[PDB]
């Protein structure tokens, strides 16, 4: 099938700067009729997708001229000459030449800002939850930039990948940072077998692991 590969998947810009998004198809997407059905769609937060560019390089009605498309065969590029607030959102390339019609993974056009280290806080299970037989440990990692972060739970020094639920906020509309919550859910009995609980983050703002821990008995 035709795989559509977009690069990059996240694109931080300053408003007023140029943006370029690459879309590479796994084979030629020229239809037998000689048309290249390569389209670019923008989905802004809270909205449905909207057409920007069709047939590689043609702007749809109502689309500002700061949007342009180019490419041939298997290599395509969307450019925005001067990025506006209303351009922020997720861009998808789409090929309709071959069935299944396929979309790229999306490129999130977001805002650049200076790096910011997360404020990391860890929380033991509540007595209320323990009485019902469960035990969730929660780690918040707040107000960081860039969005790239690796978060690992360790219980008595061993990584725990199972039982985890993560959630993330959108880029903050005022300070442009990101926040994350990670919850590791265990049984009460498992929680009470173990001693040391650790939320370990890797982020470009620290040369070493950012660690927050507690002991069940402290």
């Amino acid at each position: 099938d035709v795989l559509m590969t977009q690069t990059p998947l996240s694109l931080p810009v300053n408003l007023g700067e140029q943006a370029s998004i690459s879309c590479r198809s796994s084979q030629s997407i020229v239809h037998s009729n000689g048309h290249t059905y390569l389209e670019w769609y923008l989905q802004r937060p809270g909205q449905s997708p909207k057409l920007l560019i069709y047939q590689v390089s043609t702007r749809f009605s109502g689309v500002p001229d700061r949007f342009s498309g180019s490419g041939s065969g298997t290599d395509f590029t969307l450019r925005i000459s001067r990025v506006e607030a209303e351009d922020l959102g997720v861009y998808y390339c789409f090929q309709a030449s071959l069935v299944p019609l396929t979309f790229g993974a999306g490129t999130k056009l977001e805002l650049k800002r200076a790096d910011a280290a997360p404020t990391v806080s860890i929380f033991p299970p509540s007595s209320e939850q323990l009485t019902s037989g469960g035990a969730s440990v929660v780690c918040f990692l707040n107000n960081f930039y860039p969005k790239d972060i690796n978060v690992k739970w360790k219980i008595d020094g061993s990584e725990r990948q199972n039982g985890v639920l993560n959630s993330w906020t959108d880029q903050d509309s005022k300070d442009s940072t990101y926040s994350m919550s990670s919850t590791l859910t265990l049984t009460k009995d498992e929680y009470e077998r173990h001693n040391s609980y650790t939320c370990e983050a890797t982020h470009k703002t620290s040369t070493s692991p950012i660690v927050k821990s507690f002991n069940r008995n402290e």
Partner: protein, 224 residues
């Protein structure tokens, strides 16, 4: 030109999803446009499902085709989609998109109008009120100039809940995270960060309302 999708909102696994896209402002019959269904699974990008052309020819995504049936009723100006045997992974926003063109260079076609979408959640759960757990730090994490408290809202169905701190009087320093579906139920969390001179000397409580279960609960964050 307007498109509007409708569907069941919630289904239990194994059920058949029946979607309708209702068109106005133009005739499906006359225009010769095609129509597709496209979905956006939770946490994912867009995925094309099926297409119906003016002449009722049909194309499907082979990843899902065995479960899909697209159809049309031009007299009602409606296009339909059936998806059999739904399960969790079908939780998505479903969009109808018109495959238009400038009239009438038929070869130069593209998705020019999209509906607002219809949301589907697939879960075996009945309506289930949240368990609301206050998150207090260990004592050793209360010695700085600020302190972060939290609230964990676990195991509810369906969305939404509303969460506030001190009935909305505590609004700065708050991060409330999007709900996530897991094992048929939603979990949400929220943190609030205050000066150490604010808590525990002043009480801080998370308030959680879940309209579907007619529940409202307050949980004071007690120091450990």
């Amino acid at each position: 030109v307007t498109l509007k999708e409708s569907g069941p909102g919630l289904l239990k696994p194994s059920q058949t999803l029946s979607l309708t896209c209702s068109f106005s402002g133009f005739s499906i019959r006359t225009s010769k446009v095609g129509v597709s269904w496209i979905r956006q699974p939770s946490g994912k990008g867009l995925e094309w499902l099926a297409h119906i052309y003016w002449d009722d020819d049909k194309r499907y995504n082979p990843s899902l085709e065995s479960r899909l049936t697209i159809s049309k009723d031009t007299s009602r100006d409606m296009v339909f989609m059936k998806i059999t045997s739904v399960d969790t992974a079908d939780t998505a926003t479903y969009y109808c998109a018109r495959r238009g063109f400038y009239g009438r260079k038929y070869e130069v076609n593209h998705f020019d109008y999209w509906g607002q979408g219809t949301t589907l959640t697939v879960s075996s759960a009945k309506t289930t009120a949240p368990s609301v757990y206050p998150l207090a730090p260990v004592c050793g994490d209360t010695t700085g100039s600020s302190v972060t408290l939290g609230c964990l809202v676990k195991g509810y169905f369906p969305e939404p809940v509303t969460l506030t701190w001190n009935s909305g009087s505590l609004s700065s320093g708050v991060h409330t995270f999007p709900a996530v579906l897991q094992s048929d139920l939603y979990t949400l969390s929220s943190s609030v960060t205050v000066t150490s001179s604010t808590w525990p000397s002043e009480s801080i409580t998370c308030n959680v309302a879940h309209p579907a279960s007619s529940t409202k609960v307050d949980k004071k964050i007690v120091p450990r």
